[PDB]
């Protein structure tokens, strides 16, 4: 499996979550917000037809 992490403008881990193999999971980031993270065959994290904001970035926390 793969891990999904969300960072803020300062590239600081603000959200965390787990993502299955070849799947996707929505993580909670902010007082009231969330972002969907899709895991590719190569554990590549990416958004689902959606864009980021405030510099929100995604990082692979590693293995679940």
Question: In words, what does this structure look like?
Answer:
This protein has no helices and 6 strands. It has 64 residues and is mostly beta strands. The chain has one domain: Complement Module, domain 1 (Ribbon). The strands form 2 sheets. The chain has a 3-stranded antiparallel β-sheet with strand order 2-1-6, with no helix packed on it. The protein is globular, with a radius of gyration of 11 Å. It starts with a strand and ends with a strand.
* Sequence of strands across the biggest β-sheet: 2-1-6
Secondary-structure arrangement, i.e. CATH architecture: Ribbon
Count helical runs.
Answer: 0
Structural class given helices, strands, pairing? mainly beta
Beta strands, count: 6
Return the string of H and E elements. Answer: EEEEEE
Q: Could you name the CATH class?
A: Mainly Beta
Q: How large is the radius of gyration?
A: 11 Å
Kindly, what is the distance between the CA atoms of the first and last residues, rounded to a whole number of angstroms? 5 Å
Protein name: Host-selective toxin protein
Keywords: Signal
Organism: Pyrenophora tritici-repentis
Disulfide bonds: 2-43, 18-64
Topology diagram in text:
Blueprint: E1 2-7, E2 13-19, E3 24-28, E4 34-39, E5 45-46, E6 57-62
Domain ToxB-like N-terminal ascomycota: 2-58
Protein name: Host-selective toxin protein
Keywords: Signal
